[PDB]
Amino acid sequence: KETAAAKFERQHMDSSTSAASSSNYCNQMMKSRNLTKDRCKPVNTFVHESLADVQAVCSQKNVACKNGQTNCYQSYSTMSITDCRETGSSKYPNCAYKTTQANKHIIVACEGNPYVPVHFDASV
């Protein structure tokens, strides 16, 4: 099993690129990050900032999580991100995604010691 922190990094971190490289980015990344294995994960966001910058968000703006939880944090600054979403013609195991690039505040839930992101809540 995965730690919550490592799962966040696998699902959401892509510091190797400043932004999605092509319209095929999501198709490639959802596969290689093992998010089409048992099912097509329907929605997933990748962040193109350093891990340090993303972890730092846990010391930024404390806000409520969508589910009412109080351990969510919004980045003070906007970050380069990619939203990946299943589109029509997507049927497991043939997963197909729409790639949408953006520059937005991210909102994450944080836990543990060290206090690090464990769930991607939303972008604004």
Side-chain angles (χ1 to χ4, degrees), residues 12-79:
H12 303 296
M13 289 302 302
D14 184 11
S15 312
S16 69
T17 188
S18 55
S21 42
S22 73
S23 55
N24 205 56
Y25 175 88
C26 285
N27 289 329
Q28 293 168 315
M29 292 289 300
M30 293 302 288
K31 175 174 182 300
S32 63
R33 296 300 187 89
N34 295 323
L35 301 168
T36 67
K37 203 175 180 172
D38 31 32
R39 59 176 304 205
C40 304
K41 189 182 185 195
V43 182
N44 191 65
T45 303
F46 289 97
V47 188
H48 313 282
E49 300 294 350
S50 65
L51 179 60
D53 276 6
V54 179
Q55 284 170 339
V57 175
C58 299
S59 79
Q60 299 180 16
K61 192 62 174 193
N62 186 219
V63 297
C65 307
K66 285 192 176 173
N67 66 9
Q69 281 173 214
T70 69
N71 63 323
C72 271
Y73 300 81
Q74 175 165 330
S75 61
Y76 292 140
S77 190
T78 60
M79 288 185 176

Side-chain angles (χ1 to χ4, degrees), residues 98-110:
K98 175 173 167 52
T99 301
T100 309
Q101 175 64 36
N103 240 91
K104 278 147 19 183
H105 303 273
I106 69 166
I107 295 164
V108 296
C110 301

